[PDB]
Amino acid sequence: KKDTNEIVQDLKKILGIVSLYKILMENNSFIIRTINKVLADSNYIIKIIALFNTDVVSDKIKLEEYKDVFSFSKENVIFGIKCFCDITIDGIKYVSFFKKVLPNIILFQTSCVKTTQFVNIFSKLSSIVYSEILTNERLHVLFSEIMASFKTKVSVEDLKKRKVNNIQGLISEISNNREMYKNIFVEEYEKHKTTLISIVQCITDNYNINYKENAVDIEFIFDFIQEHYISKL
Ligand SMILES: CCCCCC/C=C/CCCCCCCCCC(=O)O[C@H](COC(=O)CCCCCCCCCCCCCCC)COP(=O)(O)OC[C@@H](O)CO
Ligand SMILES: CCCCCCCC/C=C/CCCCCCCC(=O)O[C@H](COC(=O)CCCCCCCCCCCCCCC)COP(=O)(O)OCCN
Ligand SMILES: CCCCCCCC/C=C/CCCCCCCC(=O)O[C@H](COC(=O)CCCCCCCCCCCCCCC)COP(=O)(O)OCCN
Ligand SMILES: CCCCCCCC/C=C/CCCCCCCC(=O)O[C@H](COC(=O)CCCCCCCCCCCCCCC)COP(=O)(O)OCCN
Ligand SMILES: CCCCCCCC/C=C\CCCCCCCC(=O)O[C@H](COC(=O)CCCCCCCCCCCCCCC)COP(=O)(O)OCCN
């Protein structure tokens, strides 16, 4: 909305933390406060939207529309945490940091699922996501194809010539070129959708990831999100 300046500060420290376990303990105050603040701010997604859609701050109507779609109540967060615990990964360290941050998450206590059950499922998903990003060859080929396509549309050398190398310069580049980066996102997603869904569906099948004891359906999830959220932007 107005002071989305606080989001970029939190984004700087998060990106400063990942650039530099040992770190996580010194920043656990920052990580705990940020999660509780994000979860208690029902308009947080809309502030993120307004960071990249600077025009929205001057359109009261569309801004209010966004609250109907993207605002989440405290109850929504509890329901999501509950739904997150119906995931099982019968196909399968840092568990410690999670098991000492998550108790300090106010809204994770209002639900109070078995924290060991939650820590386990969050820990598994987190290790799958990191391992695949690090090692899935299909995903690396896909990223490289996206990157090469992006580069025929936009001069990455010229972007760095114009000081597009900070997150503030990155946000400002996107938000002043919003239609174009939107069209590039859509064209890349539609061109590569068959392989993206396939990569992710295979990862879930491989690790035998279930939701309420039914196989996860990636096509349905992506299509649900397109219809109910990405299309209302
Ligand atoms: C960790 C949880 C994350 C969950 C989701 C979070 C991700 C958010 C990504 C934000 C990207 C911003 C892009 C905004 C602009 C999108 C386009 C749009 O807003 O509009 C249309 C939306 O439908 C379209 O297909 C647009 C194509 C996009 C559809 C794909 C998005 C699905 C993502 C699923 C995420 C799954 C999460 C868990 C993974 C197992 C574009 O469709 P077209 O009719 O072909 O073209 C016409 C456009 O010119 C009209 O505007
Ligand atoms: C490796 C990383 C793992 C980390 C996991 C964190 C997840 C990160 C992203 C979470 C974004 C989730 C966005 C929700 C999308 C769908 C929301 C939605 O409104 O659709 C509704 C959702 O219904 C569902 O079944 C969704 C089940 C999936 C829940 C997953 C949400 C996880 C949220 C956890 C919050 C983070 C807390 C972290 C600290 C405790 C469908 O409508 P309905 O069937 O009619 O029921 C609702 C009406 N009563
Ligand atoms: C260097 C590493 C950077 C990679 C990630 C980029 C960092 C920033 C990520 C941005 C995520 C923000 C998500 C919410 C943003 C809200 C988007 C939104 O409101 O929608 C549109 C505007 O917002 C945007 O354009 C955000 C687009 C973000 C995508 C940036 C990347 C583009 C494509 C590159 C790679 C393709 C990935 C595809 C994967 C299959 C609204 O369109 P419009 O208002 O109808 O047209 C305006 C004409 N005046
Ligand atoms: C780098 C980004 C990767 C992070 C991914 C971490 C995943 C943690 C958060 C996941 C929440 C995503 C929200 C999904 C919302 C789906 C909307 C929905 O309809 O909910 C339900 C869809 O089913 C679900 O809820 C699925 C539950 C979430 C599964 C999460 C596991 C997928 C992650 C696999 C790992 C992929 C690694 C990717 C690496 C790049 C409706 O199901 P239903 O009630 O049984 O209806 C009948 C079924 N046809
Ligand atoms: C730089 C950061 C990148 C973030 C990129 C996000 C940009 C936005 C792009 C689209 C994201 C799509 C996710 C949709 C989430 C909407 C949640 C929601 O609507 O809550 C409800 C869904 O509730 C659920 O079932 C699951 C609840 C999980 C909600 C968790 C939301 C908190 C997450 C905050 C996200 C913060 C971003 C992280 C970056 C620091 C709506 O359901 P309803 O009761 O049927 O209908 C009532 C309508 N309000």
- Please give the structure tokens belonging to residue 137: 């060859």
Best of 84, 217, 220 for a ligand 4 pocket test (most atoms within 8 Å of beta carbon):
220
Distance (Å, whole) CA 101 – CA 50: 29
Q: Nearest-5° angle of CA 216, CA 69, CA 228?
A: 40
Distance (Å, whole) CA 178 – CA 57: 14
With a Cβ cut-off of 6 Å, ligand 2 is lined by: 35, 77, 80-81, 83-84, 102, 105, 108, 122, 125-126, 129
Look-up: residue for tokens 């549309």?
Answer: 153
Distance (Å, whole) CA 159 – CA 188: 20
Distance (Å, whole) CA 97 – CA 22: 10
Q: Nearest-5° angle of CA 43, CA 10, CA 164?
A: 105
Distance (Å, whole) CA 106 – CA 118: 15
Distance (Å, whole) CA 216 – CA 198: 13
Nearest CA to ligand 4 atom 37: 129
Nearest CA to ligand 2 atom 37: 81
- Please give the structure tokens belonging to residue 147: 């990157």
User: What determination technique applies here?
Assistant: X-ray
- Are 33 and 105 contacting, i.e. CB atoms less than 8 angstroms apart? no
Question: Could you tell me whether strands 87-89 and 214-215 are parallel, antiparallel, or unpaired per DSSP bridges?
Answer: unpaired
- Are 10 and 169 contacting, i.e. CB atoms less than 8 angstroms apart? no
- Please give the structure tokens belonging to residue 95: 């568990």
Taking the CA of residue 225 as reference, the ligand 5 atom at the shortest distance is 12
Q: CB neighbours of 4 closer than 8 A, spacing ≥ 6?
A: 47, 48, 50, 51
Q: CB neighbours of 151 closer than 8 A, spacing ≥ 6?
A: none
Which ligand number lies closest to the CA of residue 37? 5
Gap from CA of 123 to ligand 4 centroid (Å): 16
Taking the CA of residue 35 as reference, the ligand 2 atom at the shortest distance is 39
Q: Domain residues of the chain, as ranges?
A: 1-233
Gap from CA of 40 to ligand 4 centroid (Å): 23
Distance (Å, whole) CA 171 – CA 165: 10
Written as one letter, the residue type at 98 is F
C-alpha distance from residue 84 to each of 3, 20, 56, 75, 120 (Å) = 31, 30, 32, 14, 11
- Please give the structure tokens belonging to residue 106: 């106010």
Alpha-carbon torsion (229, 202, 136, 102), positive or negative: positive
State the DSSP code for 71. Answer: -
